[PDB]
Write a protein that binds this ligand. Structure first.
Ligand SMILES: [Mg+2]
Ligand SMILES: [Mg+2]
Ligand SMILES: [Mg+2]
Ligand SMILES: [Mg+2]
Ligand SMILES: [Mg+2]
Ligand SMILES: [Mg+2]
Ligand SMILES: [Mg+2]
Ligand SMILES: [Mg+2]
Ligand SMILES: [Mg+2]
Ligand SMILES: [Mg+2]
Ligand SMILES: [Mg+2]
Ligand SMILES: [Mg+2]
Ligand SMILES: [Mg+2]
Ligand SMILES: [Mg+2]
Ligand SMILES: [Mg+2]
Ligand SMILES: [Mg+2]
Ligand SMILES: [Mg+2]
Ligand SMILES: [Mg+2]
Ligand SMILES: [Mg+2]
Ligand SMILES: [Mg+2]
Ligand SMILES: [Mg+2]
Ligand SMILES: [Mg+2]
Ligand SMILES: [Mg+2]
Ligand SMILES: [Mg+2]
Ligand SMILES: [Mg+2]
Ligand SMILES: [Mg+2]
Ligand SMILES: [Mg+2]
Ligand SMILES: [Mg+2]
Ligand SMILES: [Mg+2]
Ligand SMILES: [Mg+2]
Ligand SMILES: [Mg+2]
Ligand SMILES: [Mg+2]
Ligand SMILES: [Mg+2]
Ligand SMILES: [Mg+2]
Ligand SMILES: [Mg+2]
Ligand SMILES: [Mg+2]
Ligand SMILES: [Mg+2]
Ligand SMILES: [Mg+2]
Ligand SMILES: [Mg+2]
Ligand SMILES: [Mg+2]
Ligand SMILES: [Mg+2]
Ligand SMILES: [Mg+2]
Ligand SMILES: [Mg+2]
Ligand SMILES: [Mg+2]
Ligand SMILES: [Mg+2]
Ligand SMILES: [Mg+2]
Ligand SMILES: [Mg+2]
Ligand SMILES: [Mg+2]
Ligand SMILES: [Mg+2]
Ligand SMILES: [Mg+2]
Ligand SMILES: [Mg+2]
Ligand SMILES: [Mg+2]
Ligand SMILES: [Mg+2]
Ligand SMILES: [Mg+2]
Ligand SMILES: [Mg+2]
Ligand SMILES: [Mg+2]
Ligand SMILES: [Mg+2]
Ligand SMILES: [Mg+2]
Ligand SMILES: [Mg+2]
Ligand SMILES: [Mg+2]
Ligand SMILES: [Mg+2]
Ligand SMILES: [Mg+2]
Ligand SMILES: [Mg+2]
Ligand SMILES: [Mg+2]
Ligand SMILES: [Mg+2]
Ligand SMILES: [Mg+2]
Ligand SMILES: [Mg+2]
Ligand SMILES: [Mg+2]
Ligand SMILES: [Mg+2]
Ligand SMILES: [Mg+2]
Ligand SMILES: [Mg+2]
Ligand SMILES: [Mg+2]
Ligand SMILES: [Mg+2]
Ligand SMILES: [Mg+2]
Ligand SMILES: [Mg+2]
Ligand SMILES: [Mg+2]
Ligand SMILES: [Mg+2]
Ligand SMILES: [Mg+2]
Ligand SMILES: [Mg+2]
Ligand SMILES: [Mg+2]
Ligand SMILES: [Mg+2]
Ligand SMILES: [Mg+2]
Ligand SMILES: [Mg+2]
Ligand SMILES: [Mg+2]
Ligand SMILES: [Mg+2]
Ligand SMILES: [Mg+2]
Ligand SMILES: [Mg+2]
Ligand SMILES: [Mg+2]
Ligand SMILES: [Mg+2]
Ligand SMILES: [Mg+2]
Ligand SMILES: [Mg+2]
Ligand SMILES: [Mg+2]
Ligand SMILES: [Mg+2]
Ligand SMILES: [Mg+2]
Ligand SMILES: [Mg+2]
Ligand SMILES: [Mg+2]
Ligand SMILES: [Mg+2]
Ligand SMILES: [Mg+2]
Ligand SMILES: [Mg+2]
Ligand SMILES: [Mg+2]
Ligand SMILES: [Mg+2]
Ligand SMILES: [Mg+2]
Ligand SMILES: [Mg+2]
Ligand SMILES: [Mg+2]
Ligand SMILES: [Mg+2]
Ligand SMILES: [Mg+2]
Ligand SMILES: [Mg+2]
Ligand SMILES: [Mg+2]
Ligand SMILES: [Mg+2]
Ligand SMILES: [Mg+2]
Ligand SMILES: [Mg+2]
Ligand SMILES: [Mg+2]
Ligand SMILES: [Mg+2]
Ligand SMILES: [Mg+2]
Ligand SMILES: [Mg+2]
Ligand SMILES: [Mg+2]
Ligand SMILES: [Mg+2]
Ligand SMILES: [Mg+2]
Ligand SMILES: [Mg+2]
Ligand SMILES: [Mg+2]
Ligand SMILES: [Mg+2]
Ligand SMILES: [Mg+2]
Ligand SMILES: [Mg+2]
Ligand SMILES: [Mg+2]
Ligand SMILES: [Mg+2]
Ligand SMILES: [Mg+2]
Ligand SMILES: [Mg+2]
Ligand SMILES: [Mg+2]
Ligand SMILES: [Mg+2]
Ligand SMILES: [Mg+2]
Ligand SMILES: [Mg+2]
Ligand SMILES: [Mg+2]
Ligand SMILES: [Mg+2]
Ligand SMILES: [Mg+2]
Ligand SMILES: [Mg+2]
Ligand SMILES: [Mg+2]
Ligand SMILES: [Mg+2]
Ligand SMILES: [Mg+2]
Ligand SMILES: [Mg+2]
Ligand SMILES: [Mg+2]
Ligand SMILES: [Mg+2]
Ligand SMILES: [Mg+2]
Ligand SMILES: [Mg+2]
Ligand SMILES: [Mg+2]
Ligand SMILES: [Mg+2]
Ligand SMILES: [Mg+2]
Ligand SMILES: [Mg+2]
Ligand SMILES: [Mg+2]
Ligand SMILES: [Mg+2]
Ligand SMILES: [Mg+2]
Ligand SMILES: [Mg+2]
Ligand SMILES: [Mg+2]
Ligand SMILES: [Mg+2]
Ligand SMILES: [Mg+2]
Ligand SMILES: [Mg+2]
Ligand SMILES: [Mg+2]
Ligand SMILES: [Mg+2]
Ligand SMILES: [Mg+2]
Ligand SMILES: [Mg+2]
Ligand SMILES: [Mg+2]
Ligand SMILES: [Mg+2]
Ligand SMILES: [Mg+2]
Ligand SMILES: [Mg+2]
Ligand SMILES: [Mg+2]
Ligand SMILES: [Mg+2]
Ligand SMILES: [Mg+2]
Ligand SMILES: [Mg+2]
Ligand SMILES: [Mg+2]
Ligand SMILES: [Mg+2]
Ligand SMILES: [Mg+2]
Ligand SMILES: [Mg+2]
Ligand SMILES: [Mg+2]
Ligand SMILES: [Mg+2]
Ligand SMILES: [Mg+2]
Ligand SMILES: [Mg+2]
Ligand SMILES: [Mg+2]
Ligand SMILES: [Mg+2]
Ligand SMILES: [Mg+2]
Ligand SMILES: [Mg+2]
Ligand SMILES: [Mg+2]
Ligand SMILES: [Mg+2]
Ligand SMILES: [Mg+2]
Ligand SMILES: [Mg+2]
Ligand SMILES: [Mg+2]
Ligand SMILES: [Mg+2]
Ligand SMILES: [Mg+2]
Ligand SMILES: [Mg+2]
Ligand SMILES: [Mg+2]
Ligand SMILES: [Mg+2]
Ligand SMILES: [Mg+2]
Ligand SMILES: [Mg+2]
Ligand SMILES: [Mg+2]
Ligand SMILES: [Mg+2]
Ligand SMILES: [Mg+2]
Ligand SMILES: [Mg+2]
Ligand SMILES: [Mg+2]
Ligand SMILES: [Mg+2]
Ligand SMILES: [Mg+2]
Ligand SMILES: [Mg+2]
Ligand SMILES: [Mg+2]
Ligand SMILES: [Mg+2]
Ligand SMILES: [Mg+2]
Ligand SMILES: [Mg+2]
Ligand SMILES: [Mg+2]
Ligand SMILES: [Mg+2]
Ligand SMILES: [Mg+2]
Ligand SMILES: [Mg+2]
Ligand SMILES: [Mg+2]
Ligand SMILES: [Mg+2]
Ligand SMILES: [Mg+2]
Ligand SMILES: [Mg+2]
Ligand SMILES: [Mg+2]
Ligand SMILES: [Mg+2]
Ligand SMILES: [Mg+2]
Ligand SMILES: [Mg+2]
Ligand SMILES: [Mg+2]
Ligand SMILES: [Mg+2]
Ligand SMILES: [Mg+2]
Ligand SMILES: [Mg+2]
Ligand SMILES: [Mg+2]
Ligand SMILES: [Mg+2]
Ligand SMILES: [Mg+2]
Ligand SMILES: [Mg+2]
Ligand SMILES: [Mg+2]
Ligand SMILES: [Mg+2]
Ligand SMILES: [Mg+2]
Ligand SMILES: [Mg+2]
Ligand SMILES: [Mg+2]
Ligand SMILES: [Mg+2]
Ligand SMILES: [Mg+2]
Ligand SMILES: [Mg+2]
Ligand SMILES: [Mg+2]
Ligand SMILES: [Mg+2]
Ligand SMILES: [Mg+2]
Ligand SMILES: [Mg+2]
Ligand SMILES: [Mg+2]
Ligand SMILES: [Mg+2]
Ligand SMILES: [Mg+2]
Ligand SMILES: [Mg+2]
Ligand SMILES: [Mg+2]
Ligand SMILES: [Mg+2]
Ligand SMILES: [Mg+2]
Ligand SMILES: [Mg+2]
Ligand SMILES: [Mg+2]
Ligand SMILES: [Mg+2]
Ligand SMILES: [Mg+2]
Ligand SMILES: [Mg+2]
Ligand SMILES: [Mg+2]
Ligand SMILES: [Mg+2]
Ligand SMILES: [Mg+2]
Ligand SMILES: [Mg+2]
Ligand SMILES: [Mg+2]
Ligand SMILES: [Mg+2]
Ligand SMILES: [Mg+2]
Ligand SMILES: [Mg+2]
Ligand SMILES: [Mg+2]
Ligand SMILES: [Mg+2]
Ligand SMILES: [Mg+2]
Ligand SMILES: [Mg+2]
Ligand SMILES: [Mg+2]
Ligand SMILES: [Mg+2]
Ligand SMILES: [Mg+2]
Ligand SMILES: [Mg+2]
Ligand SMILES: [Mg+2]
Ligand SMILES: [Mg+2]
Lengths: 48, 275
RNA sequence: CCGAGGGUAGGGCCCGUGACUGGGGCGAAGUCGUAACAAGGUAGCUGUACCGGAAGGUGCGGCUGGAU
RNA sequence: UGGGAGAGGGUGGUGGAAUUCCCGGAGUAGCGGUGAAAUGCGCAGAUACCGGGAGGAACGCCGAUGGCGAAGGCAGCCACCUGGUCCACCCGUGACGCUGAGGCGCGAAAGCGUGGGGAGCAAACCGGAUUAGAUACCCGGGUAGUCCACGCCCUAAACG
RNA sequence: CGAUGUCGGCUCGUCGCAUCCUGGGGCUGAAGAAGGUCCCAAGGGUUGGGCUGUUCGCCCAUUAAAGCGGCACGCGAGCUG
RNA sequence: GAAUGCCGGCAUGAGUAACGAUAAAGAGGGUGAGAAUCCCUCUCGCCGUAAGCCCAAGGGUUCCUACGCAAUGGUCGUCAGCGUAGGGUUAGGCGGGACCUAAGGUGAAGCCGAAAGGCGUAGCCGAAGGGCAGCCGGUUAAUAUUCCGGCCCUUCCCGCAGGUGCGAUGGGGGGACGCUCUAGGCUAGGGGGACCGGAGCCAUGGACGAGCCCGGCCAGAAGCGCAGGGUGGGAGGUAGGCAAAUCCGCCUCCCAACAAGCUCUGCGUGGUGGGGAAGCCCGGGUGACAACCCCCCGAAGCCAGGGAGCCAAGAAAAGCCUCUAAGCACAACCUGCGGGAACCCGUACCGCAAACCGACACAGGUGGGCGGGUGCAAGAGCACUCAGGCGCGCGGGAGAACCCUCGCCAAGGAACUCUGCAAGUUGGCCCCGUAACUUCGGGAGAAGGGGUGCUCCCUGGGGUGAUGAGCCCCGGGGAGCCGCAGUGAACAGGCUCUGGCGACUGUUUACCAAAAACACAGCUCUCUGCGAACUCGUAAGAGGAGGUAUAGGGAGCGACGCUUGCCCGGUGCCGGAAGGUCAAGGGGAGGGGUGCAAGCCCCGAACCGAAGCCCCGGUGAACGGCGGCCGUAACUAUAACGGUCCUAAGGUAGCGAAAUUCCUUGUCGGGUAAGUUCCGACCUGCACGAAAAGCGUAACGACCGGAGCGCUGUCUCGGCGAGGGACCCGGUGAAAUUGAACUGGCCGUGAAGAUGCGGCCUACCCGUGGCAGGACGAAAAGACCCCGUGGAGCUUUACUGCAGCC
RNA sequence: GAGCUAGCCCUGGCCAGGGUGAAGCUGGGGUGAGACCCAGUGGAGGCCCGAACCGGUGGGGGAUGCAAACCCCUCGGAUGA
């Protein structure tokens, strides 16, 4: 049956990407936290 | 007249449609239509703020001339009567000897190829627009402004009209379509005659599908819901109302008046609606 | 081949019969009221509509086959 | 051919009286109703009176035992459209007539459908009386309806 | 109650005997035939339908008879639902 | 030593289940240490509106080749989407960008918000919509509209020549649009040919033949031809298209008007470039100087912005054309021609799947295009089959029970069961024929019945041609032939009578309910006069609506027919300038503290002072409500009638043992041999009743009752047979569960149901296939039930707040 | 977090074949004129049958599954909400 994950690159970058996070106060806190934890990827890598 | 159908489907048995007889042009003037931004009853926050809207036929908005004092003195020939999907009334294409082209809403009796004009000097004939203070007492009238130069706002739907009742200084006393007796400033423009397409009310949609074409999504009773939804929600089996009948938001919906009793226009409304 | 007829299926007409039910006729020795014949105690009658335990009433229009 | 009388019929316009309501004024202890009363209405200002306004229906006098129509039925006034009918001339046609099963059309009131409109009235209804009782007659209220359009209904003491 | 699945049916039986039938008896208000009532007896037998989820019951047509109870109202790691 | 503890390791169940579609395999040859599993040939089977081909997502080297087999692969492995290494993706024209706008997003100006931020016309961004110039063939192990070949084309720059008032983000035209149906003519694609090309073949009884088998095209600028699309021309006046305007719009005169003209596209042709089958030779070669022609069928594609009808009335902006404004008119633009110039990113491979989403090489899910042939009336249905692709990554045997899926069955035919559940029956097309009732549409495929293959003979119209033959389509009428049987296989209704509920098509509890529930046209009440009411938001701002009472919100009812009674005392709503109660505030009689004082400070009566409530009235398709007792008629029975208590008023019409009835299987009638259900009645309705509508109602329903006919393994009552498993051998090899175990029956005892205690009985040791009575068997710290001064959803005239409103 | 799901908004796409035969139109009949009637044409519809496609009715299988909702047979819609 139709499952939950239906990959779509434009949706991925437009929803979770770096420029979307920097828009909002919430998104910047996401970046700040993930940089503070030392995450290798700040944001989901989508091919473009 | 209104077009009935032989009952060759269960729905054609009751469906009735307008006969579209006054129509002379089946295409709208290109320079007077613009796209109509369908909203679905959602506002700028994207939230439904008017329920049960959406999904009806695509439309172009035909630009209607609700001013007409715009062009006092300039006569115009009635070049066409057209179908506007954005209103109950029919629309009339005017060819101004000026060269300009405009749409008014089509009055009853308006004739293809007749002439109409606006101004303090216009004859008292169907389709002409004058400030109220120059239309005689007793004539029925439509496309009436509420305040001077703000545009026609009263008596706009198919069949409606208002009747002048007399002069009281700077103001004329109108009887609106609802029976309300109101003062309107004398410099407000109106158009002699009633609005056309009076058979509009006699149309029988016939099937749920017709309502959907009109962009009317199905309305669902509060009594069919649950308590988290509606004051009439819940109850085991069917339930009477068990409280004064109420809207989805709690206010009472049989009789509770709702106009603001300090609204400044109260000083101009003589008598409330009758029926 | 036709063919008495038998068989399957579906229709029309008639008759008898039926739990129950509708009013009708007759019975008379009852109960209720008293609508009509006198101006019959609200003149009558009438088509129709609405209503009433019952006769009946009332509305709208009609007739005189209505007393004074 | 030339004239006449008429509430004959259809559509549109339009005039005054009165009833009710709303507004302004003035004014106060009742009003209204009946056989007599009560319900009702009224000091939250009624009735009676004056000014203004809205709205519907009906047409006082003329009006008569009258006129018209095939019957039902038709009444303020104006115009348009239209029917029937009488008279006088004795000009045209030449028996072209009379009746009329069927058919078709018209058909008071009430009633129905869709939509208007709704003043007065008024089935149903509610209340007061009357009465032995009074689902009535009388009184105070009152919804259909009465009115307009279009579509049905097709009845009658539709009677001379 | 850190679960002992709960009515009826179907299937499969098994047991008790306070015995429906068949076998053996005594009393009879047992002439015969047919019954009544108690005694011995559990070896075998104890039908097919209509109605209702039904157990039970009533009814139809039969029968030698159409018995009544226990087995977690026998049996859902056997089925049904 | 225990916490259903935590982490890890290892056991047991166990050589057990299973090894993932029942489309299917067999042999030979080769490679190799090793072969059911890799390669090659032959035979067999399966998909073929796919199980084939192409594209877009998504995936990200999985592509190609060499070498390899530890792990991965459900077995094996010499193979591989695996390991290692090397190679592979080529564009002005295909797609996106250097173009346009859509919703939406962002956002100069501007507005709002404690902050963070929220909006916001223009502008900008935003595509799978508009727009814009490449087709065919060849080539590589692997890319190709990209490289090469042939033939075409686009833009930018510069120059030349001719021509013109040139010139734009400004004005205008145009771009520019729906649904359904449809004409003409073409093309894609298809079929036939006795015609053209072709390696061959003659078998096994016949055939050297109008024999068999194979093939018989593709792209192509300008011209031309055929079909179509689009577009009136001239002059005058001109006050409108926010400047201007010769443009466009408007008025008037003339001419042309279903024409032609000008223009654009499609198809055909076209100089030219290509392609090119079977067969047999070790993907290549020959076939072959391959031929490349005629006839029919024919699109849903093309001409295209075609045509008609209809109501629900069907994007924008740019490219383009035209107009002018500044400006500039040695420029600039237009047209032709010529040279130059032409960037960035994608391109491999899989792509209905072993490479994507589902933890797996997972019977599931995944948008667009092509999708051949014959027959069945048609078709994308069904059967078989082309091209192409596969045989589903465990096999080999055996021939038990039992399971699954499937076939048949004597006699009976629903006796089965809660129920005909399930499975039979019926089944396409053509002809005949067809009832109640009905809203006149229907009900209706009602029901029921006849026909159906093949051969010969005669014959009727149509399409293409030409008017004819040829082909092709729709028929008609006779005469025969064969079988158990002619939609001979596959795909393809069982029917009827009668109640309930819902009018109807629709919608729903993703994953236990598809319904009688929701919705629905339609009906009514009610609110709202426009800066509407109402909704979201603190606000700005939005929706409502670029709508205006024939409109918009809220509520109930639910097509349609006939209807919808009585009660306004309580609650709600609505109306009421009186009166009563009423808060802040106003007012300040009078009283107090303090000071030697003037003074300062504090309390405070009447009186004035809103909404709300109280008071008066209205209001039911507003919340809601709609009685009890006694007695009375020539016989009993009953009570039209009288009385009385109570109430706000005592249930009207209709219906009623009902989706409602306790008693209850009420009673009566119908059907049945028999009927707690069903239908029809009756009415003492425990406890119907009129928009939480009442009573009906044609048509409709995968809804729920009852009956009958047809037919059946549902059953009496089971038997046989088929395949996949179960069983046996080789390969690989789980699971929950598990205090440890050396784990029998009875009758007792025991915390009240004992393998484990007592007595007795029985019993050699250990497995395999089976069945499920026990181990109070496994699973889940019972959902019922209670307890906890545990939680959470929901209600209200519980309490107390808040928003909102007055 | 709306890449599942629910609604809406913008923009594209898909729906083999067959059947029924509404209005309108034309002809004819009819009438004073009409209504209307008959035949032809015509192609309407939350119209019928049935693939794709969208569903999920009944039964059976599956139940440490091929699958944390699947499979087979059957069945609903299929120009429209
Ligand atoms: Mg998706
Ligand atoms: Mg994407
Ligand atoms: Mg994308
Ligand atoms: Mg996206
Ligand atoms: Mg982003
Ligand atoms: Mg990480
Ligand atoms: Mg790093
Ligand atoms: Mg992040
Ligand atoms: Mg109709
Ligand atoms: Mg019609
Ligand atoms: Mg009609
Ligand atoms: Mg119908
Ligand atoms: Mg119908
Ligand atoms: Mg019409
Ligand atoms: Mg019209
Ligand atoms: Mg259009
Ligand atoms: Mg425009
Ligand atoms: Mg607009
Ligand atoms: Mg809008
Ligand atoms: Mg926005
Ligand atoms: Mg929303
Ligand atoms: Mg709303
Ligand atoms: Mg909405
Ligand atoms: Mg719409
Ligand atoms: Mg209109
Ligand atoms: Mg003023
Ligand atoms: Mg009209
Ligand atoms: Mg209309
Ligand atoms: Mg309507
Ligand atoms: Mg509605
Ligand atoms: Mg609703
Ligand atoms: Mg509910
Ligand atoms: Mg919620
Ligand atoms: Mg709540
Ligand atoms: Mg609530
Ligand atoms: Mg409730
Ligand atoms: Mg309730
Ligand atoms: Mg409820
Ligand atoms: Mg209830
Ligand atoms: Mg409920
Ligand atoms: Mg309910
Ligand atoms: Mg309900
Ligand atoms: Mg109910
Ligand atoms: Mg309730
Ligand atoms: Mg209620
Ligand atoms: Mg209540
Ligand atoms: Mg105002
Ligand atoms: Mg016979
Ligand atoms: Mg015989
Ligand atoms: Mg009398
Ligand atoms: Mg009398
Ligand atoms: Mg009398
Ligand atoms: Mg009565
Ligand atoms: Mg009585
Ligand atoms: Mg009366
Ligand atoms: Mg009379
Ligand atoms: Mg006073
Ligand atoms: Mg008189
Ligand atoms: Mg007659
Ligand atoms: Mg009449
Ligand atoms: Mg009436
Ligand atoms: Mg009235
Ligand atoms: Mg009395
Ligand atoms: Mg009435
Ligand atoms: Mg009425
Ligand atoms: Mg008379
Ligand atoms: Mg327990
Ligand atoms: Mg446990
Ligand atoms: Mg347990
Ligand atoms: Mg015995
Ligand atoms: Mg004897
Ligand atoms: Mg003895
Ligand atoms: Mg025995
Ligand atoms: Mg025994
Ligand atoms: Mg029983
Ligand atoms: Mg029991
Ligand atoms: Mg019983
Ligand atoms: Mg016997
Ligand atoms: Mg015996
Ligand atoms: Mg027992
Ligand atoms: Mg017991
Ligand atoms: Mg018990
Ligand atoms: Mg038991
Ligand atoms: Mg079980
Ligand atoms: Mg059980
Ligand atoms: Mg049991
Ligand atoms: Mg068990
Ligand atoms: Mg067991
Ligand atoms: Mg057990
Ligand atoms: Mg159950
Ligand atoms: Mg311990
Ligand atoms: Mg554990
Ligand atoms: Mg454990
Ligand atoms: Mg542990
Ligand atoms: Mg652990
Ligand atoms: Mg074992
Ligand atoms: Mg497995
Ligand atoms: Mg398996
Ligand atoms: Mg199979
Ligand atoms: Mg091998
Ligand atoms: Mg090997
Ligand atoms: Mg091989
Ligand atoms: Mg095929
Ligand atoms: Mg991946
Ligand atoms: Mg590779
Ligand atoms: Mg490659
Ligand atoms: Mg390996
Ligand atoms: Mg290996
Ligand atoms: Mg190995
Ligand atoms: Mg492995
Ligand atoms: Mg595997
Ligand atoms: Mg090797
Ligand atoms: Mg591999
Ligand atoms: Mg290499
Ligand atoms: Mg190139
Ligand atoms: Mg550039
Ligand atoms: Mg842009
Ligand atoms: Mg862009
Ligand atoms: Mg694009
Ligand atoms: Mg391009
Ligand atoms: Mg080309
Ligand atoms: Mg390559
Ligand atoms: Mg447009
Ligand atoms: Mg388009
Ligand atoms: Mg459509
Ligand atoms: Mg063909
Ligand atoms: Mg061909
Ligand atoms: Mg031949
Ligand atoms: Mg041609
Ligand atoms: Mg000008
Ligand atoms: Mg070749
Ligand atoms: Mg050669
Ligand atoms: Mg040659
Ligand atoms: Mg098509
Ligand atoms: Mg067109
Ligand atoms: Mg319309
Ligand atoms: Mg735009
Ligand atoms: Mg030029
Ligand atoms: Mg660049
Ligand atoms: Mg690049
Ligand atoms: Mg490539
Ligand atoms: Mg698929
Ligand atoms: Mg596909
Ligand atoms: Mg693959
Ligand atoms: Mg994979
Ligand atoms: Mg596999
Ligand atoms: Mg798969
Ligand atoms: Mg093909
Ligand atoms: Mg076939
Ligand atoms: Mg066929
Ligand atoms: Mg099919
Ligand atoms: Mg073939
Ligand atoms: Mg296989
Ligand atoms: Mg064996
Ligand atoms: Mg048999
Ligand atoms: Mg039978
Ligand atoms: Mg039989
Ligand atoms: Mg049954
Ligand atoms: Mg069949
Ligand atoms: Mg019948
Ligand atoms: Mg009929
Ligand atoms: Mg048949
Ligand atoms: Mg044959
Ligand atoms: Mg042709
Ligand atoms: Mg056969
Ligand atoms: Mg088959
Ligand atoms: Mg069928
Ligand atoms: Mg059947
Ligand atoms: Mg029937
Ligand atoms: Mg019903
Ligand atoms: Mg339904
Ligand atoms: Mg329903
Ligand atoms: Mg309905
Ligand atoms: Mg429905
Ligand atoms: Mg449907
Ligand atoms: Mg569900
Ligand atoms: Mg659920
Ligand atoms: Mg669920
Ligand atoms: Mg769930
Ligand atoms: Mg289910
Ligand atoms: Mg469900
Ligand atoms: Mg259904
Ligand atoms: Mg629902
Ligand atoms: Mg419903
Ligand atoms: Mg209704
Ligand atoms: Mg709010
Ligand atoms: Mg705003
Ligand atoms: Mg707006
Ligand atoms: Mg509006
Ligand atoms: Mg509903
Ligand atoms: Mg209904
Ligand atoms: Mg009827
Ligand atoms: Mg009340
Ligand atoms: Mg009240
Ligand atoms: Mg209350
Ligand atoms: Mg003082
Ligand atoms: Mg009412
Ligand atoms: Mg009450
Ligand atoms: Mg109520
Ligand atoms: Mg009652
Ligand atoms: Mg009553
Ligand atoms: Mg009863
Ligand atoms: Mg009964
Ligand atoms: Mg009933
Ligand atoms: Mg009841
Ligand atoms: Mg009870
Ligand atoms: Mg009962
Ligand atoms: Mg009972
Ligand atoms: Mg009985
Ligand atoms: Mg009994
Ligand atoms: Mg039953
Ligand atoms: Mg039942
Ligand atoms: Mg009784
Ligand atoms: Mg309700
Ligand atoms: Mg249904
Ligand atoms: Mg259903
Ligand atoms: Mg069997
Ligand atoms: Mg067999
Ligand atoms: Mg077998
Ligand atoms: Mg097998
Ligand atoms: Mg077998
Ligand atoms: Mg062995
Ligand atoms: Mg041990
Ligand atoms: Mg024991
Ligand atoms: Mg032992
Ligand atoms: Mg022990
Ligand atoms: Mg021991
Ligand atoms: Mg001991
Ligand atoms: Mg012991
Ligand atoms: Mg023993
Ligand atoms: Mg066991
Ligand atoms: Mg077992
Ligand atoms: Mg044990
Ligand atoms: Mg147990
Ligand atoms: Mg639990
Ligand atoms: Mg716990
Ligand atoms: Mg517990
Ligand atoms: Mg518990
Ligand atoms: Mg308890
Ligand atoms: Mg407590
Ligand atoms: Mg406690
Ligand atoms: Mg709580
Ligand atoms: Mg909470
Ligand atoms: Mg409010
Ligand atoms: Mg989504
Ligand atoms: Mg679109
Ligand atoms: Mg379709
Ligand atoms: Mg036809
Ligand atoms: Mg037409
Ligand atoms: Mg349909
Ligand atoms: Mg349909
Ligand atoms: Mg599905
Ligand atoms: Mg299913
Ligand atoms: Mg089945
Ligand atoms: Mg089966
Ligand atoms: Mg199962
Ligand atoms: Mg499961
Ligand atoms: Mg399946
Ligand atoms: Mg299936
Ligand atoms: Mg089917
Ligand atoms: Mg269908
Ligand atoms: Mg279809
Ligand atoms: Mg259709
Ligand atoms: Mg449909
Ligand atoms: Mg649509």
């Amino acid at each position: 049956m139709k499952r939950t994950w239906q990959p779509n690159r434009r949706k991925r970058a437009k929803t979770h990407g770096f420029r979307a996070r920097m828009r909002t106060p919430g998104g910047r806190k996401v970046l700040k936290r993930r940089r503070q934890k030392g995450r290798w990827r700040l944001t989901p890598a989508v091919r473009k | 007249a209104v077009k009935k159908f032989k009952p060759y489907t269960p729905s054609r048995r009751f469906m009735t449609v307008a006969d579209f007889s006054e129509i002379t042009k089946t295409e709208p003037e290109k320079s007077l239509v613009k796209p109509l931004k369908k909203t679905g009853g959602r506002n700028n926050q994207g939230r439904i703020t008017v329920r049960f809207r959406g999904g009806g036929h695509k439309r172009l908005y035909r630009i209607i001339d609700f001013k007409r004092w715009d062009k006092v003195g300039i006569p115009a020939k009635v070049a066409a009567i057209e179908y506007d999907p954005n209103r109950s009334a029919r629309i009339a294409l005017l060819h101004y000897v000026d060269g300009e082209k405009r749409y008014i809403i089509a009055p009853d009796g308006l004739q293809v190829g007749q002439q109409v004009v606006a101004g303090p000097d216009a004859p008292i004939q169907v389709g002409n627009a004058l400030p109220l203070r120059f239309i005689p007492v007793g004539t029925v009238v439509h496309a009436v402004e509420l305040e001077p130069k703000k545009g026609a706002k009263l008596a706009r739907a198919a069949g409606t009209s208002a009747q002048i009742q007399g002069r009281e200084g700077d103001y004329v006393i109108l009887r609106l379509p609802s029976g309300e007796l109101r003062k309107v400033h004398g410099e407000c423009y109106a158009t002699v005659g009633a609005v056309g397409n009076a058979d509009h009310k006699n149309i029988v949609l016939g099937k749920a599908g017709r309502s959907r074409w009109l962009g009317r999504r199905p309305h669902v009773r509060g009594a069919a819901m649950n308590p988290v939804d509606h004051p009439h929600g819940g109850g085991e089996g069917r339930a009477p109302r068990g409280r004064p009948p109420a809207s989805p938001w709690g206010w009472q919906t049989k009789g509770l008046k709702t106009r603001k009793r300090r609204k400044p226009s109260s000083r101009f409304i003589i008598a409330r609606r009758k029926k």
